[PDB]
Amino acid sequence: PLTEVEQKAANGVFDDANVQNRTLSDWDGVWQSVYPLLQSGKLDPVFQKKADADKTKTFAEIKDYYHKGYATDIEMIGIEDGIVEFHRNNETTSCKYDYDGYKILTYKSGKKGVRYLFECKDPESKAPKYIQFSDHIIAPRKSSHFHIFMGNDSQQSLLNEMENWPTYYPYQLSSEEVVEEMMSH
């Protein structure tokens, strides 16, 4: 169900002229952090396969890399009617985020990605001032999973973040299915 342009953009290959703005509604739904799967051992098959297929890397290096990447105490995210909710252990923050457009990034690998930028302008909210979505999509399309960046300093600080990228799949997916997607999608 992917066009050549979408399929290549998914793999970090695209012309900048094909990148288009999106809206918050692309990430509407209830979403679950993948971090507990890593911690329980349920992602081990993912790292096992990757380590096997790549002769220059080991299981421990791969798992540690995703441990840094996935680490977060934000267990779920809900997005509905313009509001993003961050669920921690019993505690919950939210904001009606403003869209701020996107930024195209060229990574050290020469692959490319796009960050979709939002800002909380509610002086009453306790949610992060700036957030960014990255999900291998460069034009309007409902997301099937996403990486999110959050902070209070600047958008540019987040643009540089490459170590920690808390990651979220639809909360209705079983663990097997989240594993299958990480192996396949």
145 annotated ligand binder: yes
Burial annotation 112-126 (CB, 10 A radius, 16+ → b, else e):
bbbbbbbebeeeebe
Q: Which fold has domain 1-185?
A: Lipocalin (2.40.128)
What are the strands of the beta sheet with 92-96, ordered from one edge? Answer: 92-96, 83-87, 76-80, 29-33, 167-170, 146-151, 130-134, 112-119, 98-106
- For residues 106 and 58, is the Cβ–Cβ distance under 8 A? no
67 annotated ligand binder: no
What kind and span of H or E run contains 10?
Answer: helix 4-10
Resolution (A): 2.1
147 annotated ligand binder: yes
